[PDB]
């Protein structure tokens, strides 16, 4: 029963079209709760969950100050990256940052994260011990030496083990009805003939939360990893997720195939069989 809090930020340079676009989103597990978009009208951190709306003006002002100041810092970081890589001011580049923490079911700290990617590749990351860095190339080694000199890891560790954990614990309690819920999957099976002797069986899992699920097909109790198509778990738009797994079977042999469903909302795994 572990939980996570993550913020994902993206700065994208737009040469000849103004300042870089900056977007930051905050999640608790699979639920988004805040956003910041430099293109939006407010220039403020905005609520994206019913349970966070109640936070007072000191919260919204402090969070706005932090995310806006980060957008201005990462705007300057795009310029520094152009200098490290000798890249022209005419091309579009991306700087992504992720940070956050994980807590166990008892609310105790489990893990902390702080990492950057430049143009879709790892640039520099704080290691699991929260005291040292992994640099992906020789330009990131220059950054690593600057951050060691300025004791940056000790400043990040303080947030990651303190404020981050306190914040996630508070959100899990405040947003309990949304965040601590489990929506088990609602399942159904469809059947469509594809040829004179073959049909497609499709096993559906709808309306579930959290997103983590496993759908597997078996033929006479044997794991069928071939003649199977699996789609990536996708958001429904209402706070739940969907997924399906399909198998091409010989006509008249539908009853030999079973679809197995595993999810946090199913204390025992479920087995589905056509008709």
């Amino acid at each position: 029963g572990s939980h996570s809090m993550r913020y994902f930020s993206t700065s994208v340079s737009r040469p000849g079209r103004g300042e870089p676009r900056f977007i930051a989103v905050g999640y608790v597990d699979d639920t988004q709760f805040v956003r910041f978009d430099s293109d939006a009208a407010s220039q403020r951190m905005e609520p994206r969950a019913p349970w966070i709306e109640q936070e007072g003006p000191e919260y919204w002002d402090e969070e706005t100050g932090k995310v806006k100041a980060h957008s201005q810092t990462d705007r300057e970081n795009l310029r520094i990256a152009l200098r490290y890589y000798n890249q022209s001011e005419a091309g579009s580049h991306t700087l992504q940052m992720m940070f956050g923490c994980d807590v166990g079911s008892d609310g105790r700290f489990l893990r902390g994260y702080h990492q950057y990617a430049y143009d879709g590749k790892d640039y520099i990351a704080l290691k699991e011990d929260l005291r040292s860095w992994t640099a992906a190339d020789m330009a990131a080694q220059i950054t690593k030496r600057k951050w060691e000199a300025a004791h940056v890891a000790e400043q990040q560790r303080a947030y990651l083990e303190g404020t981050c954990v306190d914040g996630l614990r508070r959100y899990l309690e405040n947003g309990k009805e949304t965040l601590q819920r489990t929506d088990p999957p609602k399942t159904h099976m469809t059947h469509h003939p594809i040829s004179d002797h073959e049909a497609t069986l499709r096993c559906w899992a709808l309306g579930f939360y959290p997103a983590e699920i496993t759908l597997t097909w078996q033929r006479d109790g044997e794991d069928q990893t071939q003649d199977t198509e699996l789609v990536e778990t996708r958001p429904a738009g209402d706070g739940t997720f969907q997924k399906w797994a399909a198998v091409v079977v010989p006509s008249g042999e539908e009853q030999r195939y079973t679809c197995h469903v595993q999810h946090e909302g199913l204390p025992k795994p479920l087995t589905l069989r056509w008709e």
């Binding site: 913020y7 930051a24 905050g26 951190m45 969070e63 932090k66 995310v67 100041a69 980060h70 810092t73 300057e76 970081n77 520094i80 990256a81 490290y84 940070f99 702080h114 950057y116 640039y123 520099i124 990131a140 950054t143 600057k146 951050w147 300025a150 940056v152 400043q155 990040q156 947030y159 404020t163 981050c164 306190d166 914040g167």
Partner: peptide, 9 residues
Amino acid sequence: LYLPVRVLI
């Protein structure tokens, strides 16, 4: 709670 520590690369 957003990270309060900002760093230049």
